[PDB]
Amino acid sequence: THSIIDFLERPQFIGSFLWNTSDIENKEIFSLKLPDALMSPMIREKLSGFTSFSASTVFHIQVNAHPFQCGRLVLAAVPVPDILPLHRLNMLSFDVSNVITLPHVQLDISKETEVLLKIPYVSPFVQYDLVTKFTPWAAFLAHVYAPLNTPSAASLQVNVFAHFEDIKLGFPTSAIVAQ
Amino acid sequence: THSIIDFLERPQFIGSFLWNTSDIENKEIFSLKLPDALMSPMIREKLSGFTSFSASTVFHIQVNAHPFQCGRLVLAAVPVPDILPLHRLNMLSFDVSNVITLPHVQLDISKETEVLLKIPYVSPFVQYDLVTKFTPWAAFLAHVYAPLNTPSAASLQVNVFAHFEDIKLGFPTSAIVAQ
Amino acid sequence: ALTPLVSSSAVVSSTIDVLVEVKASDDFEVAVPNTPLWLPVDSLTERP
Amino acid sequence: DEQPSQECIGERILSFSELIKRNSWRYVSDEKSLIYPAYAFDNPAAMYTAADKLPVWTLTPRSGFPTLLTSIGAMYAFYRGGIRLKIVPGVADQPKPLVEVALFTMQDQGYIIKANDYSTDFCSSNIYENFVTKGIAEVQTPYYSRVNTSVVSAPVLYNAGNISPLMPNVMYKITSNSSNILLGHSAADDFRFGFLLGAPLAISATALRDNFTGSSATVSLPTFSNFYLS
Amino acid sequence: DEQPSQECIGERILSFSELIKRNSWRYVSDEKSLIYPAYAFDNPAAMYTAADKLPVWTLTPRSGFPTLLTSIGAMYAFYRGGIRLKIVPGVADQPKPLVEVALFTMQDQGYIIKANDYSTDFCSSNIYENFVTKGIAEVQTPYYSRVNTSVVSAPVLYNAGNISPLMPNVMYKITSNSSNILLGHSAADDFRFGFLLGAPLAISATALRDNFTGSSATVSLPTFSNFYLS
Amino acid sequence: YVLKIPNYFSRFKYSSTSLPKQVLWTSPVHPQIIRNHVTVVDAPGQPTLLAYATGFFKYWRGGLVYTFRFVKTNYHSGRVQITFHPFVGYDDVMDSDGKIVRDEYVYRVVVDLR
């Protein structure tokens, strides 16, 4: 039998992202906001009729390098991006070391074809306000740790897959899912 | 905790329908198709992603007559309307007696403020084809049995409420809910 | 509303009053007492 | 569930009885020697207006401004029990730092504020506190009533004097050596209100800063800030 | 081995939780009557330069200078719990030695420093301390938050006023009779920080005495020495 | 004790006029329910007891007991649905015609007046 949760637990393809030889230390590959990045029509449909929701969030990153390409990524998490004191948000774009301090996981394309990270719901609000849309509760970001090192210049696709877990829904309502 | 079914089990207001003094024996008040009549955005959203579904269907009819108004309705059910041999479909609009023979329930406004009827899914197809939209599996219809009998002409609102029960969903799909 | 308030205009008004009262539930709680929002007086009047 | 109250507030409050033990300010005086009517619980009379070049609100206190105490009391008809009294100075007079609060019971005296005239009221209950050493004067007052049940803001009368049964027939005589003095009160431990009536006649407080008539907001309240800076 | 710590130091410290209960100074004011935003945890904005005849560093505080508290807090995203508050006087005003700290909650008021204007905020939580007798004013502040988890240096907004959920919707009203006053704070007993992020944006402190551009070092900090001598 | 004292705070009308899905009445759900002074006409108004009391605090939470009385005879007949819409204001519950929006999605409370 099927249920709402089953859908939010469904793992979606979120994006393919370019990473090429020229990209340098701490070069941001992406910066995706929770829940925004997952808010596909599929989800929106099923979340319709509910004031809000909270969940942990699973992130699979996929990178099909071939044997002669070596390189290294970070995937890290950061909370409540929208309202973090700027200096923080900056420190991240400034220096990869201020990402390495975070909740993160490293990926070495030569060894690993993939890696995951799970992120709990963390916020002053108990759920993501689906009508006010008040502050996405976190964001994943993938800065380059050690740049893609082929002999001659080339580029690689970083795929992202993701779903929710440990889901919790708010009281139901005639209010509409924030655009 | 919440689940898809919970929504389809939610009872929707389907329509208010006029019934007035002038309306006569076997005058059709309405003729609503299953599942069409219930296919509100709310439902469509949650049914999205599924090839088809089947269910029994509950119909509440509401008629707030005041003490000095007497009259009488039928509420009846009829299967697979789209493909019934015409003569049948006709016989119904022809003569109330060919509705009284059906699966039905009578309503006497002086006594009752309401009545229900439940209709099982019945069809050659095992479910309602949500993509082909192939034949609505039944239809409720309310013909007037005994016309509204006020001293001076007047009119009355026949409300309808309804939901599903005994629900069953089909394999899930990238095909879209038939418009 | 779902239906008009059908009645015999012949003998009863065809419009009625509906009164609404409120009180707190059991689970009701307040906190952080301070300068109040309201201020009480012995009489209120227009200025000359 | 009493979780929120422990996770966020850190306290949890259940009766106004709790609240009215918090001392709030009532009234100010310029008199070195003052007669105050302790169990006066009235509030000011208010005046509103929309006309240009006029102060919107205006307040005429008969015996003081709303304390938590009175503000609450307005809801009820009756009271019993005793009260506390707190006093603050304009002036910490080094050589005459003292305050007398005394029990004042003169029968004929009227139950509203007035400056001390009597020089002949020997041998009364006198408490003394030192303004210099202990910044504030703190006091407790017995119900000392002729009856077991007194009335919220009893209409005093011209020669109800100080023997009305509907209150404790008792006042404060306050003799300081600060020109200006600030009075406040909370309820005592044994104090209780009675027979809830409804909301009292009231107006927004935050609204008292209205000045849309151009004529600026005049009406102020007895707070510390307003007192200490003159 | 915990020998060294006992042979040399005489103590041994294990969590910043320990440290942030030490009171550090935050900000100074000239206002007798001030509105301070307790749970402001921002730090100054900094400016560096190499050009001749220019002060090397310069600091623009929005709500104060770095306390141990904030300095630490910078590392984390969230906080909860209450805080302490310490206050020092320019002037031990013998005849008006008092300080009021009061709980300030006006809804519309903005969550940044401003001088007291309101004269109409009666019946609030008021603590009093005597500058003459007890040199310093000492205070504790409930978390009193609308939520269980607040945010480090939440971006206040023009009319975020004093009702932002991302903080405790509470400020201090401080009414003294010292012209100049020095503020400091440590965390309360129940206080805690949350979700470590990394190093915060920072610069050498010892470096703030740089003057190699000839133009002398201007930027000073709120310490006792700097305050008491003016 | 106090907050559970009933505050009469509002009325309205139900009639022959009224139509299917026609909104008849709304209120925001919160404790600062107010009235108009008789003597003068300030903006703030006269607080209800509830409002006056809650007024002594900044923070509130909890549920509210709303009670409707339909002053009628037995010879009236009609239905009415009471519905609560969290996270939405009283303009947004009704479309341009004053008809209710998406009632489908919430707690619905049908009332037979017979």
Side-chain angles (χ1 to χ4, degrees):
Chain A
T1 79
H2 265 284
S3 155
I4 290 143
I5 309 317
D6 300 299
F7 279 79
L8 289 77
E9 298 203 343
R10 288 191 200 179
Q12 319 181 68
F13 181 96
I14 313 310
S16 191
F17 296 78
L18 187 57
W19 168 31
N20 69 79
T21 316
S22 83
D23 289 312
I24 63 98
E25 179 150 313
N26 205 33
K27 193 275 171 164
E28 170 192 288
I29 303 301
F30 64 67
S31 184
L32 320 182
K33 300 197 170 197
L34 296 185
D36 300 338
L38 301 195
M39 301 304 309
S40 97
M42 168 188 262
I43 306 314
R44 306 181 79 81
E45 288 157 2
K46 302 297 182 296
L47 278 177
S48 184
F50 287 116
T51 45
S52 40
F53 89 104
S54 71
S56 312
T57 332
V58 184
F59 256 52
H60 306 230
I61 55 171
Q62 292 181 3
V63 176
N64 298 75
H66 87 256
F68 307 110
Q69 316 179 159
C70 55
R72 205 198 188 79
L73 299 192
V74 176
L75 167 52
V78 73
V80 300
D82 288 12
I83 60 160
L84 292 180
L86 290 193
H87 77 83
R88 181 55 56 182
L89 296 160
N90 295 331
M91 286 284 284
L92 309 179
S93 49
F94 283 24
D95 185 4
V96 66
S97 185
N98 301 136
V99 173
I100 293 311
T101 56
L102 297 167
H104 82 270
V105 54
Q106 310 191 6
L107 189 161
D108 189 12
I109 56 179
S110 48
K111 304 303 106 182
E112 314 163 16
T113 183
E114 194 196 337
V115 82
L116 312 192
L117 189 47
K118 187 178 181 178
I119 288 304
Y121 177 93
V122 193
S123 146
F125 304 147
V126 311
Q127 298 196 340
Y128 179 75
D129 199 331
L130 280 171
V131 204
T132 316
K133 199 200 260 206
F134 205 139
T135 311
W137 72 76
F140 280 94
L141 60 111
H143 284 207
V144 171
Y145 200 163
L148 176 47
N149 199 353
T150 57
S152 53
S155 76
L156 250 172
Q157 287 312 122
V158 172
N159 296 317
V160 171
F161 282 70
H163 56 279
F164 292 113
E165 281 197 318
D166 317 285
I167 300 91
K168 278 207 170 64
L169 317 187
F171 223 77
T173 185
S174 65
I176 309 306
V177 177
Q179 255 294 349
Chain B
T1 79
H2 265 284
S3 155
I4 290 143
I5 309 317
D6 300 299
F7 279 79
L8 289 77
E9 298 203 343
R10 288 191 200 179
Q12 319 181 68
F13 181 96
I14 313 310
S16 191
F17 296 78
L18 187 57
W19 168 31
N20 69 79
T21 316
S22 83
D23 289 312
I24 63 98
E25 179 150 313
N26 205 33
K27 193 275 171 164
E28 170 192 288
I29 303 301
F30 64 68
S31 184
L32 320 182
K33 300 197 170 197
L34 296 185
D36 300 338
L38 301 195
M39 301 304 309
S40 97
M42 168 188 262
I43 306 314
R44 306 181 79 81
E45 288 157 2
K46 301 297 182 296
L47 278 177
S48 184
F50 287 116
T51 45
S52 40
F53 89 104
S54 71
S56 312
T57 332
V58 184
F59 256 52
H60 306 230
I61 55 171
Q62 292 181 3
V63 176
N64 298 75
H66 87 256
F68 307 110
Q69 316 179 159
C70 55
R72 205 198 188 79
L73 299 192
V74 176
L75 167 52
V78 73
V80 300
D82 288 12
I83 60 160
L84 292 180
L86 290 193
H87 77 83
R88 181 55 56 182
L89 296 160
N90 295 331
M91 286 284 284
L92 309 179
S93 49
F94 283 24
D95 185 4
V96 66
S97 185
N98 301 136
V99 173
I100 293 311
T101 56
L102 297 167
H104 82 270
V105 54
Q106 310 191 6
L107 189 161
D108 189 12
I109 56 179
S110 48
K111 304 303 106 182
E112 314 163 16
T113 183
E114 194 196 337
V115 82
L116 312 192
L117 189 47
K118 187 178 181 178
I119 288 304
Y121 177 93
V122 193
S123 146
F125 304 147
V126 311
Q127 298 196 340
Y128 179 75
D129 199 331
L130 280 171
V131 204
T132 316
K133 199 200 260 206
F134 205 139
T135 311
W137 72 76
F140 280 94
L141 60 110
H143 284 207
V144 171
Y145 200 164
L148 176 47
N149 199 353
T150 57
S152 53
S155 76
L156 250 172
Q157 287 312 122
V158 172
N159 296 317
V160 171
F161 282 70
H163 56 279
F164 292 113
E165 281 197 318
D166 317 285
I167 300 91
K168 278 207 170 64
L169 317 187
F171 223 77
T173 185
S174 65
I176 309 305
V177 177
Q179 255 294 349
Chain C
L2 298 189
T3 308
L5 181 41
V6 312
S7 66
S8 191
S9 50
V11 280
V12 296
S13 34
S14 298
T15 297
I16 64 173
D17 275 309
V18 173
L19 305 167
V20 196
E21 308 178 17
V22 65
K23 61 171 167 282
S25 184
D26 302 22
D27 69 352
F28 203 92
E29 183 200 330
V30 304
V32 179
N34 203 31
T35 41
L37 280 54
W38 298 105
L39 188 146
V41 296
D42 266 82
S43 58
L44 188 61
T45 50
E46 272 297 350
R47 217 166 186 285
Chain D
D1 206 318
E2 304 71 9
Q3 168 159 292
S5 50
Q6 275 143 13
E7 290 203 327
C8 299
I9 313 318
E11 82 196 344
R12 170 57 176 286
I13 319 195
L14 318 174
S15 171
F16 290 114
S17 171
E18 305 174 67
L19 186 48
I20 69 165
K21 292 155 164 55
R22 183 189 265 170
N23 282 291
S24 28
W25 302 116
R26 170 64 148 171
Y27 169 81
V28 198
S29 181
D30 328 288
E31 307 303 338
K32 296 282 201 167
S33 197
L34 173 62
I35 299 307
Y36 184 100
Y39 295 105
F41 294 130
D42 64 67
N43 281 313
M47 297 197 65
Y48 177 63
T49 181
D52 279 277
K53 183 178 179 180
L54 295 179
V56 197
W57 314 93
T58 25
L59 294 184
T60 318
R62 186 172 91 261
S63 204
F65 294 87
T67 61
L68 287 175
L69 212 178
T70 52
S71 301
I72 299 310
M75 288 182 280
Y76 303 100
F78 309 90
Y79 71 88
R80 54 174 280 103
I83 62 156
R84 267 171 252 287
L85 189 78
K86 307 295 174 210
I87 303 179
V88 153
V91 195
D93 194 40
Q94 184 281 343
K96 289 179 175 262
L98 288 184
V99 192
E100 166 179 281
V101 184
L103 204 60
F104 194 71
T105 63
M106 283 309 315
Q107 299 203 356
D108 61 2
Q109 186 71 24
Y111 214 95
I112 288 298
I113 302 114
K114 180 158 178 302
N116 165 225
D117 49 6
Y118 286 122
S119 71
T120 62
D121 57 343
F122 76 124
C123 287
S124 60
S125 271
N126 291 18
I127 80 90
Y128 302 132
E129 211 128 44
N130 177 314
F131 262 134
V132 166
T133 63
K134 185 195 151 67
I136 292 155
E138 298 195 303
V139 177
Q140 184 138 356
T141 321
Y143 184 52
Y144 261 26
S145 177
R146 278 206 294 126
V147 285
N148 61 79
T149 299
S150 288
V151 182
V152 166
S153 299
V156 194
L157 313 167
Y158 258 36
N159 58 281
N162 191 10
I163 63 90
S164 164
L166 287 47
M167 57 193 69
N169 312 163
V170 177
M171 300 175 86
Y172 305 119
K173 170 191 165 186
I174 301 152
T175 321
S176 61
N177 220 50
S178 177
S179 48
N180 269 0
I181 57 187
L182 174 53
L183 272 56
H185 58 36
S186 74
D189 218 322
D190 50 353
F191 186 92
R192 294 291 295 176
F193 278 137
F195 204 84
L196 183 51
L197 307 165
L201 183 66
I203 59 192
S204 167
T206 37
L208 297 192
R209 308 173 61 200
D210 282 331
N211 60 14
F212 60 80
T213 62
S215 164
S216 52
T218 67
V219 168
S220 81
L221 287 168
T223 75
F224 187 85
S225 54
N226 299 358
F227 178 93
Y228 231 49
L229 318 175
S230 290
Chain E
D1 206 318
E2 304 71 9
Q3 168 159 292
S5 50
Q6 275 143 13
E7 290 203 327
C8 299
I9 313 318
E11 82 196 344
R12 170 57 176 286
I13 319 195
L14 318 174
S15 171
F16 290 114
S17 171
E18 305 174 67
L19 186 48
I20 69 165
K21 292 155 164 55
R22 183 189 265 170
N23 282 291
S24 28
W25 302 116
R26 170 64 148 171
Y27 169 81
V28 198
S29 181
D30 328 288
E31 307 303 338
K32 296 282 201 167
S33 197
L34 173 62
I35 299 307
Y36 184 100
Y39 295 105
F41 294 130
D42 64 67
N43 281 313
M47 297 197 65
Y48 177 63
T49 181
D52 279 277
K53 183 178 179 180
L54 295 179
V56 197
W57 314 93
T58 25
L59 294 184
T60 318
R62 186 172 91 261
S63 204
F65 294 87
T67 61
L68 287 175
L69 212 178
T70 52
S71 301
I72 299 310
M75 288 182 280
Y76 303 100
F78 309 90
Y79 71 88
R80 54 174 280 103
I83 62 156
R84 267 171 252 287
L85 189 78
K86 307 295 174 210
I87 303 179
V88 153
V91 195
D93 194 40
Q94 184 281 343
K96 289 179 175 262
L98 288 184
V99 192
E100 166 179 281
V101 184
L103 204 60
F104 194 71
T105 63
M106 283 309 315
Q107 299 203 356
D108 61 2
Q109 186 71 24
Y111 214 95
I112 288 298
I113 302 114
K114 180 158 178 302
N116 165 225
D117 49 6
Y118 286 122
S119 71
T120 62
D121 57 343
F122 76 124
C123 287
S124 60
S125 271
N126 291 18
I127 80 90
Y128 302 132
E129 211 128 44
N130 177 314
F131 262 134
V132 166
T133 63
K134 185 195 151 67
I136 292 155
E138 298 195 303
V139 177
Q140 184 138 356
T141 321
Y143 184 52
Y144 261 26
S145 177
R146 278 206 294 126
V147 285
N148 61 79
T149 299
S150 288
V151 182
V152 166
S153 299
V156 194
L157 313 167
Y158 258 36
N159 58 281
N162 191 10
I163 63 90
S164 164
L166 287 47
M167 57 193 69
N169 312 163
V170 177
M171 300 175 86
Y172 305 119
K173 170 191 165 186
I174 301 152
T175 321
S176 61
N177 220 50
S178 177
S179 48
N180 269 0
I181 57 187
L182 174 53
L183 272 56
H185 58 36
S186 74
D189 218 322
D190 50 353
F191 186 92
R192 294 291 295 176
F193 278 137
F195 204 84
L196 183 51
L197 307 165
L201 183 66
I203 59 192
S204 167
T206 37
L208 297 192
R209 308 173 61 200
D210 282 331
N211 60 14
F212 60 80
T213 62
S215 164
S216 52
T218 67
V219 168
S220 81
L221 287 168
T223 75
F224 187 85
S225 54
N226 299 358
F227 178 93
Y228 231 49
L229 318 175
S230 290
Chain F
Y1 183 63
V2 174
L3 315 203
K4 292 180 195 182
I5 304 313
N7 300 252
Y8 163 70
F9 81 104
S10 171
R11 78 159 161 287
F12 61 97
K13 310 279 183 158
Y14 177 50
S15 66
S16 190
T17 309
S18 315
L19 303 174
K21 319 318 303 301
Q22 183 183 320
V23 172
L24 280 171
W25 182 90
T26 67
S27 169
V29 175
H30 80 305
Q32 283 295 290
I33 300 294
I34 53 180
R35 308 287 287 181
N36 308 278
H37 293 95
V38 181
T39 320
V40 315
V41 186
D42 66 328
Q46 170 60 58
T48 54
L49 162 64
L50 163 56
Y52 180 60
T54 46
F56 290 78
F57 306 87
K58 195 164 187 181
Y59 298 153
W60 71 275
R61 60 176 281 94
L64 293 171
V65 183
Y66 287 114
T67 311
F68 306 80
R69 299 182 168 70
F70 295 62
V71 178
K72 80 188 230 309
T73 83
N74 327 60
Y75 299 80
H76 295 77
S77 180
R79 281 204 225 277
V80 172
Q81 80 181 23
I82 311 195
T83 51
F84 167 68
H85 313 260
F87 284 28
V88 48
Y90 70 77
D91 276 11
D92 300 329
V93 307
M94 49 179 154
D95 65 59
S96 55
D97 309 6
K99 274 52 161 68
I100 194 168
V101 308
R102 315 174 80 257
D103 66 334
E104 306 135 57
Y105 292 77
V106 301
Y107 265 141
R108 154 156 37 199
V109 198
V110 167
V111 192
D112 193 339
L113 272 53
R114 200 204 297 266

